[PDB]
Structure formats: structure tokens, C-alpha cells
């Protein structure tokens, strides 16, 4: 009965994967950290306990709880210990020792029935899983350990007369356990790792995950960049996540020129939007964006530059004339220095993000957004007009 189920699990687990290797079976079976979670449809009492089908199969790997000594010794040595992927990477990328101490779980794999993808089972599965760790599931009605082969038995058996047999059914626990039956392990965060694609990121973004890291070098086999996204469960300190998300956003903005110029404008815009949602998560005001100070503005831009922007807003200038200053504008807006006065539509944000940061030409974005070139430049012009009018208000 168990074997029939294991085949059904592997089918769902293996379906999505491009080319699965038999190691992962050993990986699931023996790894002490790893746990398996299966979403099942409602059970009909009339079915006579038939081995049900798995709709969504989740595998999680508990990670973290690293001593502050070990991280420092390894980090100075530059050596990465096996396992605990997300802690070690985030420790390196931010040089924070406190994160490595936190207890978390990485969602190694999520798979749904391909026939049933995109109808909300996958999302439902994550929502329950968070509630399992958060502590919502409780038993209201007022052991699952299996005795190991004792040393006495080992000594009293000879190789010739060994009777190797399946473990007797009374000893074995049930195959499927209700969540309330098994207590959870205390965790602060839930992490994921996946190649960045529009569909997957939209799925994770809807499930209230937050990006914290994005590998620069695309994976050779797939052409996708590894992305890591974190979530903090209710009742735990959320500050450390927000600091990373703010720090990442700044990192992403500058790197758009270097190696993420390929990303579609909408795709890149989503990554910033997902990170910003982390700020809204923190209802506190201790960490807030700072508006541009008049002294800061003068150092960034000369008064002639402000005049030159003003002329463009009045149409008295050619577009190429203001090509120099746009990237500085982009960082200030997406750094949120501009403040509540200046806000833009989704189309305008993509256009500004393109020219300012991706360094794409106006013609390319006209194609990429499927807009006429003339309309693109017009919408761009209204953006400068809002920025110019704002710089006037500060002065």
C-alpha cells in the first residue's frame, strides 16, 4: 500500500522537473531535516480507504540554527558546509551573522498535477503550510516512534539463519497524518529557490513571499537566474527581512544595466513591486525612506541641469539633450526619494525604468510595450514634467 503511494508521489514530483536523477529519492528518504507534505482532495467515506491521489506535493528542508561561532569561522575560511543553502548564501551576500542563527525551512520542491495547474490548488497548498508552522492547526479532542532493531536481536541472529521480513503492520505508524496530530518545528521564515520566470514569480508574489537575492550569472542549462524569496511567519521579528528587501531593491536597480538588461521591462518592474510589498508589511515607521533635501539636490544636479529639464518640460528642447540626466532621475524615483508628490502609472514606470536603468533605447521599448514611438516619447515627456514641477516645489 505504501509503495503504491510512493509511485504516485514520484510521478507528481518528477513531472515538472526537466530531468530527474535517482539521488533525490535517497535524499528524501534518509535526510533528517527533510519532510514531505501532500495535499489531498476531500475523502469520500464510500471509497473504502483507497490509496488516494496526491494533487500537490511539497518537500521542505529545515535549515538554520547555526551557531554564531561556526558562521564566522567558515566565512573567514570562505568554506561552505553542505546543506543549509539559504542561510549560507544570505549570510555571504549580506555579511549578517544574526540570520544564520534563525530557524527556517526551504521549500525544496512544489509540484501539482499538470492537468490541474493554474486553478489554485498550488496556492491553497502553501496557504495551509504556512498555517501549519504558524500554529493555527490544533487538536481539540481531549506516539509515532518506531522501535529500532535492538543490539540483543543483532547478536542472537546468524547470517545463515537470518529471516529478513517486512516490518509488522502494528509497529508502523499511519502513512498520512493529520496536521494536528504531528506538532510543527519552530521556524522564523520560509524560503524558496527557483529560476526567475514570469509565471513562477507571480505565483510566489501572490503568496506573500519577498525577494532577497538574485544570482547575476544565468544558469547555463536554463538561461534563468536563480532567485531566492523569503517569508516571515506571524509573531516573529520582521525587521531583518525588511532591511534585506530594501538593500536588495537598491542592488537590483543598479544592476539592471549590467546583466538584467535582458529582462522585460514589466518583468523587472514586478521584482521591485514585490520587494516594496515588504515595506508595507512593517507597520512601524522606524525605517522609512528619506525625501530629497535641497542640499542633496544641488550636489546631484546643477541649476543649469534643472533649467535644462525645465526647458524639456516646456518642449523647447530635443529629447537627446536630456539623455544625460535620466539615469539619475530613475534611481531617485525608484529609491523613493521623490516622495508622495510624484507617482506614476504602470506604463510610465516601465518606460522610465527602461531608459534610466536598462539603458534601452526609446525605439526598443516602443516595440517591447507594443506602443508607437511617438506615444512613448510623449508619455516620457509627462514624466519629466512631473519631476520638473516637483523640483520647483522644493526650491
Amino acid at each position: 500500500v505504501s509503495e503504491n503511494f510512493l509511485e504516485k508521489m514520484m510521478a507528481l514530483y518528477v513531472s515538472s522537473h526537466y530531468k530527474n536523477s535517482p539521488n533525490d529519492l535517497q535524499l528524501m528518504s534518509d535526510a533528517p531535516a527533510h519532510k514531505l507534505f501532500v495535499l489531498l482532495p476531500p475523502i469520500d467515506p464510500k471509497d473504502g480507504g483507497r490509496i488516494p491521489d496526491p494533487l500537490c506535493v511539497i518537500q521542505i528542508a529545515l535549515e538554520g540554527e547555526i551557531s554564531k561561532e561556526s558562521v564566522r569561522n567558515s566565512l573567514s575560511r570562505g568554506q561552505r558546509a553542505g546543506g543549509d543553502l539559504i542561510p549560507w548564501l544570505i549570510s555571504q551576500q549580506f555579511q549578517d551573522e544574526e540570520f544564520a542563527s534563525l530557524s527556517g525551512a526551504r521549500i525544496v520542491r512544489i509540484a501539482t498535477n499538470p492537468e490541474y495547474a493554474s486553478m489554485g490548488y498550488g496556492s491553497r497548498a502553501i496557504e495551509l503550510l504556512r498555517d501549519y508552522f504558524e500554529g493555527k492547526f490544533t487538536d481539540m479532542s481531549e506516539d509515532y516512534s518506531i522501535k529500532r532493531v535492538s543490539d540483543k536481536e543483532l547478536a542472537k541472529t546468524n547470517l545463515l539463519k537470518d529471516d529478513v521480513k517486512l516490518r509488522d503492520a502494528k509497529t508502523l505508524p499511519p502513512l498520512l497524518l493529520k496536521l494536528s496530530e504531528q506538532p510543527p518545528h519552530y521556524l522564523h521564515y520560509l524560503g524558496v529557490s527557483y529560476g526567475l520566470t514570469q509565471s513562477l514569480h507571480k505565483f510566489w508574489k501572490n503568496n506573500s513571499f519577498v525577494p532577497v537575492y538574485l544570482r547575476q550569472t544565468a544558469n547555463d542549462l536554463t538561461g534563468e537566474h536563480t532567485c531566492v524569496m523569503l517569508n516571515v511567519l506571524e509573531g516573529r521579528e520582521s525587521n531583518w527581512l525588511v532591511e534585506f528587501a530594501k538593500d536588495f531593491r537598491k542592488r537590483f536597480l543598479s544592476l539592471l544595466s549590467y546583466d538584467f538588461h535582458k529582462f522585460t521591462a514589466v518583468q523587472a518592474l514586478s521584482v521591485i513591486e514585490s520587494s516594496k510589498k515588504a515595506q508595507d508589511l512593517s507597520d512601524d515607521e522606524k525605517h522609512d525612506n528619506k525625501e530629497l533635501t535641497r542640499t542633496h539636490l544641488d550636489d546631484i544636479f546643477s541649476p543649469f541641469d534643472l533649467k535644462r529639464l525645465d526647458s524639456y518640460s516646456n518642449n523647447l528642447l530635443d529629447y537627446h539633450v536630456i539623455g544625460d540626466m535620466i539615469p539619475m532621475l530613475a534611481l531617485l524615483y525608484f529609491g523613493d526619494k521623490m516622495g508622495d508628490s510624484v507617482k506614476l502609472s504602470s506604463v510610465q514606470s516601465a518606460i522610465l525604468l527602461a531608459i534610466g536603468l536598462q539603458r534601452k533605447n526609446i525605439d526598443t521599448i516602443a516595440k517591447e510595450l507594443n506602443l508607437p514611438s511617438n506615444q512613448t516619447i510623449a508619455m516620457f515627456a509627462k514624466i519629466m514634467r512631473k519631476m520638473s514641477q516637483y523640483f520647483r516645489q522644493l526650491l
Partner: protein, 267 residues
């Protein structure tokens, strides 16, 4: 089988929740009484003067008041015996049954109330400790090992002085009858706006009203074509050609979706 026990548990859950709402209805009806009572005199002299104004009518009203009050609170105590009995709050079934049978006097009625609250206190300690542990284990707080609920209740009961003042607060600004005359005569030792004599549970009363209110929201002939003619009509013949592609979803999926439309020990 596991389904049925869960379903039955829901019925008990519903029953307890309906029981909760019903008792609030009792509290709502009693609300005009508690306000009226806080308006009553505080002293013997005021009461006698209160009776002096209309001696005959007040005596009749007082006699009816005493009868209704005793009948009501005798009835409430009967329920508490049954309620704390039915729910296993009281373990001595024989003693509970005799109390229901016997008629009780006002002095006797107070004693059962003291007995009933005493039993609830012991049950209270066990229940909060049991569920607090269960919630702790479920959330991993057991693994971590935010005070126990029983402990929190003990601390708040320990701070009896603070919370007494909460009752004494005269938010409604009630003045009991002949209050000025009792104050002038020095008949009110406690006083010699916060009034010890006036009792105010309005904030508690409102919170109960809100919670009841929110729950309700949350739960809540052939001529002229009048006979249909199925002949071929030439002008509209082959007006449009059907698409060979068909529905974008595959047929079996479409058949599947419609079916569900509108809704070793393995386990």
C-alpha cells in the same frame, strides 16, 4: 467514521455558540434593570423616605419586586446546577440532583452561588491549563520551552484594586435616588467621576454587544411566429461556419469540470 465525530463536534460547537448568544439576550434584557438599580437609594433613611412618597403603591410594587426576583434567581440557580452538571463541571451528580429538587430560601440561594462559583474556579484552573498547553504545543511554544492563561487570570485577579476602580467609574453619570441627602448627612462612609456606590460595566456591556453584532454580520396560433417553426430558412442557411477547433479546453476536462460544478492504516 472520522467524518461523523467531527460533524457531531460541530453541532456541540454550534450549540455552545447559540447558548452564548442566548445568554447575552438575557443580559440585554437585564440591562435596564442594572441601570435602574444604580438609580435606587443607598440607605435605610432614603428608602423609607422613598416609600413615604407613595406608601401604598410602593409596598405593592416592593412585594411584586421581591416575588419576581426570588422566582427568577431561584430559576437561574436551577439552570446552573443543570448546566455545570450537564457539562461535567460538577462531579457529584447526586448532590446536584438533590439541590434541584429542594426549594431554597434567599439565604440558601446565596450559598449555592458561593458553591457554584467555587466549583467553576476549580474547573477554570484545569481548563485553561489544559488548552493553554495544547495551544502551546501546537504552535511549537513547547519546542521553544506568553504567560499561561490561568496565570494571567491569577495576576489580574491579584490586581483586584485596579479593576474595582474600573467598575466604580461613573461614565454614565448616574445619580442614585436621594444621593445628595445621603452625602450631606454623611450616611455614605465609602465616599468620605468615581462613585463606589454606582456600578458601571458599560464598556464590558458594549464589547459584548459588538461581538454579538459582528458574529451576525460574519455568518450572514402559428401566425406571427408564436408557434416555433423548425424548417430550413434559406437566406440564413450557412450564415456562419462552425469553428473546427472547438473549445480551447480539452473535452474530458470540460466534462470533468461540469460534474463538480457548483460543488497499513492509511489515515
Amino acid at each position: 467514521q472520522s467524518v461523523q465525530r467531527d460533524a457531531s463536534k460541530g453541532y456541540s460547537i454550534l450549540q455552545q455558540t447559540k447558548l452564548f448568544d442566548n445568554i447575552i439576550d438575557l443580559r440585554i434584557k437585564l440591562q435596564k434593570a442594572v441601570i435602574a438599580a444604580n438609580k435606587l437609594p443607598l440607605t435605610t433613611e432614603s428608602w423609607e423616605e422613598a416609600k413615604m412618597d407613595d406608601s401604598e403603591e410602593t409596598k405593592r410594587l416592593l412585594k411584586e419586586n421581591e416575588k419576581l426576583f426570588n422566582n427568577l434567581f431561584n430559576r437561574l440557580i436551577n439552570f446552573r446546577i443543570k448546566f455545570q452538571l450537564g457539562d461535567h463541571i460538577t462531579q457529584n451528580e447526586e448532590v446536584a440532583k438533590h439541590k434541584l429538587s429542594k426549594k431554597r430560601s434567599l439565604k440558601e440561594l446565596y450559598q449555592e452561588t458561593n458553591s457554584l462559583d467555587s466549583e467553576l474556579k476549580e474547573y477554570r484552573t484545569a481548563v485553561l491549563n489544559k488548552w493553554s498547553t495544547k495551544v502551546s504545543s501546537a504552535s511549537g511554544n513547547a519546542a521553544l520551552s506568553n504567560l499561561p492563561a490561568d496565570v494571567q487570570v491569577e495576576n489580574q485577579l491579584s490586581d483586584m484594586s485596579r479593576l474595582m476602580k474600573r467598575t466604580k467609574l461613573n461614565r454614565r453619570n448616574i445619580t442614585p435616588l436621594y444621593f445628595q441627602k445621603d452625602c450631606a448627612n454623611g450616611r455614605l462612609p465609602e465616599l468620605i467621576t468615581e462613585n463606589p456606590y454606582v456600578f458601571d460595566d458599560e464598556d464590558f456591556y458594549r464589547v459584548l454587544l459588538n461581538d454579538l453584532i459582528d458574529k451576525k454580520i460574519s455568518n450572514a396560433k402559428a401566425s406571427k411566429g408564436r408557434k416555433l417553426n423548425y424548417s430550413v430558412q434559406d437566406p440564413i442557411a450557412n450564415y456562419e461556419a462552425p469553428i473546427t477547433s472547438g473549445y480551447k479546453w480539452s473535452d474530458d476536462q470540460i466534462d470533468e469540470f461540469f460534474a463538480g460544478l457548483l460543488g497499513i492504516q492509511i489515515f
